[PDB]
Design a protein around this nucleic acid. Sequence first.
RNA 1: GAAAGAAUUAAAUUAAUAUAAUGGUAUAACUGUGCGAUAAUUGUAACACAAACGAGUGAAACAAGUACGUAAGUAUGGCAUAAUGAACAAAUAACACUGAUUGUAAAGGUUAUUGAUAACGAAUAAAAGUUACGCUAGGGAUAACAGGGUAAUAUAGCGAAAGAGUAGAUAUUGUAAGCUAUGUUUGCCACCUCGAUGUCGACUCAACAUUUCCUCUUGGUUGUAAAAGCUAAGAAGGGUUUGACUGUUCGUCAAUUAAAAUGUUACGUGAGUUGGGUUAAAUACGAUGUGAAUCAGUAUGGUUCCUAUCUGCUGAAGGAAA
RNA 2: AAAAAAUAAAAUAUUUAAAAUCAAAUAUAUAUAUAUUUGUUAAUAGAUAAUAUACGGAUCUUAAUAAUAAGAAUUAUUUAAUUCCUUGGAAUAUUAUAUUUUAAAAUAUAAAUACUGAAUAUCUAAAUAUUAUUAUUAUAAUAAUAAUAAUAUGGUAAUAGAACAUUUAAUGAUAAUAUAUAUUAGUUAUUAAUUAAUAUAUGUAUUAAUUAAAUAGAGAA
RNA 3: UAGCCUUUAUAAAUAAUAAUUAUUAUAUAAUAUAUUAUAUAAAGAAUGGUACAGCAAUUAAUAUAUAUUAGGGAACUAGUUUUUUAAUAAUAUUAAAUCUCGAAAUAUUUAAUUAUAUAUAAUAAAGAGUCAGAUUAUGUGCGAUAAGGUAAAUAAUCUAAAGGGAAACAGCCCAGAUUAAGAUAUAAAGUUCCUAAUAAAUAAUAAGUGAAAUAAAUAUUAAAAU
RNA 4: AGUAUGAAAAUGAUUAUUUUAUAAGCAAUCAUGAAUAUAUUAUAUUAUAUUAAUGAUGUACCUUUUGUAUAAUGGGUCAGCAAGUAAUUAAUAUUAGUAAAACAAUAAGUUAUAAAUAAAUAGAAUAAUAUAUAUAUAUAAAAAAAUAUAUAUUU
Lengths: 119, 82
Amino acid sequence: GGLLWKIPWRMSTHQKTRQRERLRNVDQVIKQLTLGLHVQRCQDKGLTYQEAMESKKKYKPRSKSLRLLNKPSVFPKENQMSSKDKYWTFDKKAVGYRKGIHKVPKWTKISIRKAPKFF
Amino acid sequence: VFYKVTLSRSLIGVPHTTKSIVKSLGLGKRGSIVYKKVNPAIAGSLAKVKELVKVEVTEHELTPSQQRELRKSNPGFIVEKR
RNA sequence: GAAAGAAUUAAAUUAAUAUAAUGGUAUAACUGUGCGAUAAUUGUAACACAAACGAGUGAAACAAGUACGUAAGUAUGGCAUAAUGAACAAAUAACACUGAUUGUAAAGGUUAUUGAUAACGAAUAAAAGUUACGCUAGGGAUAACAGGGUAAUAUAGCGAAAGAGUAGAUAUUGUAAGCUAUGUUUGCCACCUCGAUGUCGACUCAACAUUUCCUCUUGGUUGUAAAAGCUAAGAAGGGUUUGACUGUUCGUCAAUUAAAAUGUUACGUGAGUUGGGUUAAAUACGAUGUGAAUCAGUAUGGUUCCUAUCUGCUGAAGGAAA
RNA sequence: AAAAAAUAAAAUAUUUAAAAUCAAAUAUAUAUAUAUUUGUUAAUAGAUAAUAUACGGAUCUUAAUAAUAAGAAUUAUUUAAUUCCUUGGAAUAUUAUAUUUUAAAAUAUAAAUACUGAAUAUCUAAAUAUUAUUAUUAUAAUAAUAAUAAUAUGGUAAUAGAACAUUUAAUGAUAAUAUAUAUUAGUUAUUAAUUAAUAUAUGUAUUAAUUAAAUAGAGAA
RNA sequence: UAGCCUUUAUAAAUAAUAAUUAUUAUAUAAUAUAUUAUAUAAAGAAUGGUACAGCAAUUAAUAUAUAUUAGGGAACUAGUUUUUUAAUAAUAUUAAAUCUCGAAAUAUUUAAUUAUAUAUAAUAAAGAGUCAGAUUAUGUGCGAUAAGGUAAAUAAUCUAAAGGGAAACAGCCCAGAUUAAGAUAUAAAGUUCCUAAUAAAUAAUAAGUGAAAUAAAUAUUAAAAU
RNA sequence: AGUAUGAAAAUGAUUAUUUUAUAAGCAAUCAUGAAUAUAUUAUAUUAUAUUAAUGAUGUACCUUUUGUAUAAUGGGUCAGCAAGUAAUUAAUAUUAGUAAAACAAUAAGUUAUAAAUAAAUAGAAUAAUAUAUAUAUAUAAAAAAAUAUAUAUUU
């Protein structure tokens, strides 16, 4: 290994904060998507925008992917997530079966919340 | 109701399927704002690119001209010709 | 109540299937059987599949005829998937299409079939070597050497402790396995230039490491009485050889010494030397090849250059801010 | 021997875990029913080569007394004051400053929106291109220029488009108050041309411009 | 020769892309045990055999004071027999490039709706260049689970990409230069100094461990818990 | 190897300005003092110009490459010279002329005007759009492949 890819094995505090923020943003996006759908469905039934926003009973999304994203068991929120799953991917060939998320290529775009139950 | 979707991240490190999805959605460059009438189809498409994009719901959409007008900064002066 | 039938479920595709392996198979493709022996037929094939092309694979259908089946029908070879070969050139048909002034013919077309191109998209009908006398175009796009990458290998270390060690695993000993280190070697990789001899050894000169050979300090050592030692810690200040043979590094051997450490430094060192080895052109010897020649073989012989520009180092001045 | 008793400081271990259990939270019916999520170890030794120590370097672990004043710059989990509350708040605590009073006091108000950060984005002007409207001036359904909107405008090999310099041929005014050439200083979104100053020639442009021809452009052999 | 590229056009034009709908079931609701609507849940039309998981058949491995077979043995009075053997059965326990009875997601792809039309196909007549790739990430063959290795697969960048980060930095992290300009958001990364830019909480460390290139089995000392 | 002329460059010396004797690299750009120069509107607290205070950032070019500052390659430096061109064809585009004709004009020929088929003597509605017809296989004529042809005025 003569070429030096000087990437540290762990993240800085600032990196971790940025990661957390990014995670929070994707959750927010999902929430917005569900909310807009609900609003649209209220409008279709025949309420005003404000009335729809007020509504006690929020409509859950019917499409599959959205419904999965809504579930925390499948796609957890940043507040829900463990410290470890925010900053460590599962890597079967690593010692500890764990690897920094920053070592994943395009980790800033690519999402990866859920690790295996005991790894 | 409308999703105001914004292409927050680039499409440089992104695979070709996700690029194609973004193109279909209508977003060109980074930080280029697009309003979409809400429906299941567009929602699913947005979910498919959830990490590149920032979405937020709105009462009304805005045309490109309106958006431009909103953007324009205040010129702090009033011309008086003589 | 009984018989008999029709069977139904389960089980099975392990049997078997022309033959590999897979896929399929009992709704049977498998098995027995009657008939037959025809569709292991003849023109147009759409359309897909595959696919660069040339090719290949399935195949609706239209038409002519054959076969079996009451019939529905099925049959354009085999349960499927291998089982093959371009053109050109001849050949034998067949054809009735040309027919070079005419008529015939010759020959050529068209259809049918044929024998190989297994380096198997077949360069021709037909072509092996050697060159250390070698040459050019090149590549370093793939080996020489040296660097790098790597750490099996090699070097060292550690945990554990079977077994030695009179009596006791851990005075000293330490298998097989285990975990590391190292980046010296033999590899491995081709990433460096492949206009890097510094061509591998010697000499000159050393520099550096410490993984200490001696020398200094110190623990243990029924295996420290003493002295010799053994073993371990600190420690690199100093010091660590001269011959016989060998191109030799190496080693053996002699004589020594406190000791005669282990390395790194382009296997330290030639624009500083040598050139003995490996090394071109001569050459002979054993072995190999029909032979030219060849060989990890052995052997005699055999050409190396450079006035230092920069850096660096050794000294020596001048200038200068004092 | 030795106990204000356990509630907690005994040993012998196993252990190093939120699966389980428990606590905290989400989600459903909801006077607390299920399901999902979150919560369980540290330091030293081991330590190890060769030009030179090398976290990039400095350097960083804080201490009352005592400065306006320091107190990780390491690791783990987090905030943008803090606590509540549903991003937005409410409260208050600081921080500031003012006030006007006896350095304090009490009231006031800011302000609590961290920051750096790209040739990204927006903004602010410029160019070209394209689609869509325009405006103006003069295939007018056209063109020239100018407007507003949007979209695009990295680039080797390569494809396409459009320009310029140079030389010759056809047409061809002008004139040493000119031209040609050179230096410098300007101007024109500028390989170019042009202004001026100056030097030198030359009584003069194959001159501007349109074509057509090129021996048409050299830091690479 | 195609694959990837360009130019100029063409239209019966949306065929291109992407996503959704499609299904199973539950509640209620309305009809007629029915079947519409609504809502909720479910990795939700169709295809497949990877991971995963499993030990079924197949390929293998274990263990039985089992049995049974014959026996090896065994008093005795050949039998019975008893502490061995083998297979095979019984039970239980396991694994596998070329086993998958369970079985993902990605994926393949269907029709219609939908959004992209200053956009995609498709097709016409023409021009090319390339066929030495590299690294990085992931699942692998090879290699010693060695290599800046080698063989493909997939994704991205490079190649052919200037910029910010990673000390320096072809390929990593961001991000795509038309010409400016420099006010506003920022990305990746950072904010004691060098060096643009900060202050906090709460732990824990004392070793400069550490502070952008995490070295191990093992020993020790601690710490929780049972 | 003509004759003039020749502020063409490379290169030598000298001087003037300006910088430089505590500072380390493609030697530039940008920032920024300073010194000097010239300036017929410097009104100036001016402008421009020259110049290695000073600070920031900055790994020649080219070829060849998976990839170069590269210790891969070429060049001492300047000036001149040096490289997709010609002839005979064929095809496609675009334009212009001409047009069911064109070219050429005496003729002769070439191209298109019919598709074919190996080739021969075959050849495109017998009542209209392929369900017509034309040729090739086949054939009594059909159907079946393919290609082609017909919907005031021919293309």
